Amino acid sequence: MVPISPIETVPVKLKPGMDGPKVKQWPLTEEKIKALVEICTEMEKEGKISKIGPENPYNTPVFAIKKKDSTKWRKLVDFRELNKRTQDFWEVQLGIPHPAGLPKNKSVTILDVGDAYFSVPLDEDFRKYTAFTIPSINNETPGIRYQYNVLPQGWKGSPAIFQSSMTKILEPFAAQNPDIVIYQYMDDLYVGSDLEIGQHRTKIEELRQHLLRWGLTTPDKKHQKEPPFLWMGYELHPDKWTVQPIVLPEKDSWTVNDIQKLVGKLNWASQIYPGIKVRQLSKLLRGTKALTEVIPLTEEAELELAENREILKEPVHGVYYDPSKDLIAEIQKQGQGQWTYQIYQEPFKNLKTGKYARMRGAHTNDVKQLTEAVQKITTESIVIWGKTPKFKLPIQKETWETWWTEYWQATWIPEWEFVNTPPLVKLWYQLEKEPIVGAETFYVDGAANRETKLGKAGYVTNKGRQKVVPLTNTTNQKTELQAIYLALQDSGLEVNIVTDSQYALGIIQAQPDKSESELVNQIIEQLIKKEKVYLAWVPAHKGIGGNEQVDKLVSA
Amino acid sequence: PIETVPVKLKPGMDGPKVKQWPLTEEKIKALVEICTEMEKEGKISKIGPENPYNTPVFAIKKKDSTKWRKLVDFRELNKRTQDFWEVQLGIPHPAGLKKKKSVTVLDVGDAYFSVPLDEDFRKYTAFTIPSINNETPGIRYQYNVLPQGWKGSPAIFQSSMTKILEPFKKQNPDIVIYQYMDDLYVGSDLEIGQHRTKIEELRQHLLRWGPPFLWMGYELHPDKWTVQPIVLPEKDSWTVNDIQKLVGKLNWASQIYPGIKVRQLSKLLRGTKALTEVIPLTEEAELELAENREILKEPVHGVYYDPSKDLIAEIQKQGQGQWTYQIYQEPFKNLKTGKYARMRGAHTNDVKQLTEAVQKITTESIVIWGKTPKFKLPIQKETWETWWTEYWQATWIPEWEFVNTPPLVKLWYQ
Numbered sequence: 001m002v003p004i005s006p007i008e009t010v011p012v013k014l015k016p017g018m019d020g021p022k023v024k025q026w027p028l029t030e031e032k033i034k035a036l037v038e039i040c041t042e043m044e045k046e047g048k049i050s051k052i053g054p055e056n057p058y059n060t061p062v063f064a065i066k067k068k069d070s071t072k073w074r075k076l077v078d079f080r081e082l083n084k085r086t087q088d089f090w091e092v093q094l095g096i097p098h099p100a101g102l103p104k105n106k107s108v109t110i111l112d113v114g115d116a117y118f119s120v121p122l123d124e125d126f127r128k129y130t131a132f133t134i135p136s137i138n139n140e141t142p143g144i145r146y147q148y149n150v151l152p153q154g155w156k157g158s159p160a161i162f163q164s165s166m167t168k169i170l171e172p173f174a175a176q177n178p179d180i181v182i183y184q185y186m187d188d189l190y191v192g193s194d195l196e197i198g199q200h201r202t203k204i205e206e207l208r209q210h211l212l213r214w215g216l217t218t219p220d221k222k223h224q225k226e227p228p229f230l231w232m233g234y235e236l237h238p239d240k241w242t243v244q245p246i247v248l249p250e251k252d253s254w255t256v257n258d259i260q261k262l263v264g265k266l267n268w269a270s271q272i273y274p275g276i277k278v279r280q281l282s283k284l285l286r287g288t289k290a291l292t293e294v295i296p297l298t299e300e301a302e303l304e305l306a307e308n309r310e311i312l313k314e315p316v317h318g319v320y321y322d323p324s325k326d327l328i329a330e331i332q333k334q335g336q337g338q339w340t341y342q343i344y345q346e347p348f349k350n351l352k353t354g355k356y357a358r359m360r361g362a363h364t365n366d367v368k369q370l371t372e373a374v375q376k377i378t379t380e381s382i383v384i385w386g387k388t389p390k391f392k393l394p395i396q397k398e399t400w401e402t403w404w405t406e407y408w409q410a411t412w413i414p415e416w417e418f419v420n421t422p423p424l425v426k427l428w429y430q431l432e433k434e435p436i437v438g439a440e441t442f443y444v445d446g447a448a449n450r451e452t453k454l455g456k457a458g459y460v461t462n463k464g465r466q467k468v469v470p471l472t473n474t475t476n477q478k479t480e481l482q483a484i485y486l487a488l489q490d491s492g493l494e495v496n497i498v499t500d501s502q503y504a505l506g507i508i509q510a511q512p513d514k515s516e517s518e519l520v521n522q523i524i525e526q527l528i529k530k531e532k533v534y535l536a537w538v539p540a541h542k543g544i545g546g547n548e549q550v551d552k553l554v555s556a
Numbered sequence: 557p558i559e560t561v562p563v564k565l566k567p568g569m570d571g572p573k574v575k576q577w578p579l580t581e582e583k584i585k586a587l588v589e590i591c592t593e594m595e596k597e598g599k600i601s602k603i604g605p606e607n608p609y610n611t612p613v614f615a616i617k618k619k620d621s622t623k624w625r626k627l628v629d630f631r632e633l634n635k636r637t638q639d640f641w642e643v644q645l646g647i648p649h650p651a652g653l654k655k656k657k658s659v660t661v662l663d664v665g666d667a668y669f670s671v672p673l674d675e676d677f678r679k680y681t682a683f684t685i686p687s688i689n690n691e692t693p694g695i696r697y698q699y700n701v702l703p704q705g706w707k708g709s710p711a712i713f714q715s716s717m718t719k720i721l722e723p724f725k726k727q728n729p730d731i732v733i734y735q736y737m738d739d740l741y742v743g744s745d746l747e748i749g750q751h752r753t754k755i756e757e758l759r760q761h762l763l764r765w766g767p768p769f770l771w772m773g774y775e776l777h778p779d780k781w782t783v784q785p786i787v788l789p790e791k792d793s794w795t796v797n798d799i800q801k802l803v804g805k806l807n808w809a810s811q812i813y814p815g816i817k818v819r820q821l822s823k824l825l826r827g828t829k830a831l832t833e834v835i836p837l838t839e840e841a842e843l844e845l846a847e848n849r850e851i852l853k854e855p856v857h858g859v860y861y862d863p864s865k866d867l868i869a870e871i872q873k874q875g876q877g878q879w880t881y882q883i884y885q886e887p888f889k890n891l892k893t894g895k896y897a898r899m900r901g902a903h904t905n906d907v908k909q910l911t912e913a914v915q916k917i918t919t920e921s922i923v924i925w926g927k928t929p930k931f932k933l934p935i936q937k938e939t940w941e942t943w944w945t946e947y948w949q950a951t952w953i954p955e956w957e958f959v960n961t962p963p964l965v966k967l968w969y970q
């Protein structure tokens with residue numbers, strides 16, 4: 001008998017104030033009972049469970065499921081009630097590695113660690129709560145009562161405690177074998193390395209020898225996976241990687257469930273397929289909840305879906321990470337608040353691709369969106385690679401310098417350089433800092449009656465020019481923007497505009513180049529046509545000349 | 557330091573479960589070396605999956621230093637930790653600290669690692685050293701001693717701290733000593749030549765009565781902290797635009813000051829005039845401007861600090877490295893206003909300038925009132941959250957919210 005060191009148990013408690021489960025055992029047929037008795041007898045020989053007396057007051061129901069592939073019954077202990085009462089654990093598998101961050105590992109060996117999957121000991125003080133009862137034949141005998149000695153398949157803490165225990169076991173081997181790569185996936189250990197094929201299996205036998213210290217016999221998994229690895233939705237080849245085949249269905253009746261799976265496939269494919277757009281397609285599920293409702297496809301959605309089918313026509317592949325080379329990210333504008341990017345180290349060979357959709361707002365500009373896209377890529381790159389990439393951006397150095405030195409918010413993008421890939425991000429208008437000498441001065445104002453929704457808007461100028469327009473179904477804020485629009489429409493190339501609208505100032509001082517409001521877009525179109533525009537603010541109802549004259553003209 | 561003080565959380569509150577944000581490889585490598593040494597020294601120990609709590613951690617470099625430092629964001633744990641009452645229920649803030657002419661800030665956080673932590677509370681200090689690309693699980697630790705950045709650390713070491721300083725206090729009774737978190741604020745009215753040498757007298761006191769960062773000493777001068785009262789222009793010829801902005805500024809100040817009148821100045825705006833036209837001042841307007849100018853000389857009335865309310869700090873970007881700020885609890889009742897310029901290290905980086913500005917305003921708020929303010933930052937959330945840790949150098953972290961609408965009162969603090 002070769003001594004094996006024990007696996008340390010994790011202390012486990014129930015939630016404070018709660019007790020163990022006490023669920024009634026469901027009635028079972030005579031064939032299911034005989035099946036569970038033979039199953040639990042085998043498990044008891046292997047020490048996985050143990051018979052208990054009548055004093056244990058806890059119980060969870062056990063069931064018997066049969067599969068079609070093999071004509072055998074299977075045991076299923078329903079731990080839904082125990083899990084609701086079990087403490088929270090530190091789940092050490094919230095995320096998975098992205099393939100674009102993995103280094104090339106020549107040789108990979110798969111090991112079966114199922115011998116330890118059902119062999120991790122459970123906290124002795126907690127086994128009371130895992131009790132279950134096999135009903136007896138015709139209920140004429142007290143049922144057989146068992147409790148778990150190892151981590152039960154289905155219990156809340158089984159995945160966390162197992163991975164923690166395996167990690168503690170493997171820690172000394174990995175530390176003293178830095179040229180070895182180990183990844184845990186259910187009952188399979190993936191051990192890879194960049195060593196020659198001879199020295200690789202040498203360290204694999206050393207890993208078998210280390211794992212035997214805990215009595216864990218780990219043979220090579222039978223029927224080892226042929227390349228590529230089909231894992232978590234990817235295709236892991238020894239030198240390339242891609243997503244599993246993305247095929248777009250060609251249907252005539254498109255329901256919202258078809259689009260939820262369509263955008264899901266498009267989002268999943270956008271991490272390697274460059275130029276994928278999902279705006280007009282996901283635009284159709286703004287507030288839909290009925291998963292079976294059919295929605296017509298807009299001409300913009302059909303045109304967008306057609307662009308994706310051409311992109312998804314030919315499969316593309318990504319490369320693996322080389323730490324010795326620089327990390328480079330490049331962004332392109334696609335329109336309608338859509339951006340796409342590629343991350344690479346060598347040209348024409350991408351590590352991965354991606355996309356960014358603009359946040360839902362009322363007013364926006366390309367510079368703000370490009371900045372948001374940069375921060376997203378920056379955060380994603382630190383996740384995947386642990387560093388910030390060099391950026392290639394479609395915006396002039398002068399354009400960025402002018403933007404951030406004049407923007408009212410603090411802003412910053414990391415090390416970047418200009419790439420002349422149209423369409424380029426541009427500043428479409430820039431207001432003046434001082435009043436314009438020789439330019440006509442428009443005093444604007446608007447007003448509306450909240451009850452009747454009737455309003456007026458217009459201007460008065462220093463040259464005697466005047467206009468007042470009657471408006472129906474309007475608001476105070478709406479007539480204030482309309483008044484500014486009228487002043488831009490009827491002025492020359494240079495104009496000074498004087499308003500008292502704090503609302504209009506806040507919109508214009510945000511410097512948008514596109515808006516959900518049609519009136520704001522018309523103002524932007526007018527601003528782009530001008531040479532110089534100075535926008536001045538004054539307090540309202542303070543006897544200010546010109547402002548008070550047009551205020552009396554618009555208030556009816 | 558044998559026994560541990562029994563501490564707990566607030567009634568009906570659980571431990572902190574805050575997500576660890578990503579870190580660069582250089583900062584992960586630094587945290588691994590730091591935590592390996594702390595583990596050997598017994599300061600921290602590894603934890604298992606039965607501990608579901610987490611508190612974020614990252615690595616910084618203090619001002620004028622080369623080696624990394626571990627910084628733990630205990631903000632969530634601090635607000636969930638019970639309020640501390642010692643043999644004294646509370647100390648009022650020393651109002652003389654802000655009156656001294658020189659205040660040196662000394663990091664004394666290393667003195668906390670000699671006092672053990674209550675074994676029932678250690679699980680709540682859990683933190684994770686993240687891994688790159690989820691390739692390995694995060695290295696999970698918890699604290700065994702009083703941790704730097706936790707509000708209970710000075711509130712437990714305070715009994716021991718009063719005795720270490722007792723010899724130095726008797727020798728110099730005119731020296732104000734105040735402690736906030738990991739820092740020690742020592743103020744006096746003597747010259748820097750006598751101050752710097754006297755400051756090092758306290759450095760060897762921690763060496764004898766008990767550190768890596770004990771050598772550094774941040775020097776402040778609260779006697780030379782500038783105030784920003786409301787000022788009006790002094791011109792000889794006023795354009796229509798000059799008077800419009802003047803009336804606008806005076807109308808804004810009328811919310812703060814009683815008796816501000818703009819009637820005679822509004823009379824000068826005679827209908828629709830070109831913005832660049834010079835308007836002569838009348839006698840009625842000059843006296844109105846003069847009366848308003850005398851009003852703005854006096855401070856605001858009914859302006860008091862309330863220890864129960866929060867301190868709010870707003871910041872405006874004025875351009876060319878200039879930033880203005882105001883500290884208040886009620887709107888239009890500033891307890892402190894100021895302006896910063898020539899931010900060191902950042903003349904092409906807005907975020908680094910704002911980051912240094914937040915740290916300086918927080919330091920002033922600690923010296924004056926003994927607590928940190930809630931910041932209203934002129935920056936989009938995604939940009940600030942991505943980069944502020946890259947420029948942070950203080951051992952504490954304030955709260956903050958994000959302003960997404962341009963303020964109009966900016967041009968009036970300029």
Ligand SMILES: Cc1cc(/C=C/C#N)cc(C)c1Oc1nc(NC2CCN(Cc3ccc(S(C)(=O)=O)cc3)CC2)nc2ncccc12
Pocket residue numbers: 097102103104105106107108109181182183190191192225226227228229230231236237238239320691692
């Ligand atoms: C080892 C491992 C396996 C899987 C999934 C398996 C399934 N299902 C997933 C991950 C994340 C994982 O963990 C890590 N993987 C890597 N590198 C990858 C890069 C190449 N791929 C593709 C490949 C090459 C060769 C062959 S073969 C049959 O021998 O021809 C077959 C496939 C495998 C190893 N580096 C790592 N570094 C640090 C930490 C972990 C690393």
Ligand SMILES: [Mg+2]
Pocket residue numbers: 445446447500540551
């Ligand atoms: Mg009006």
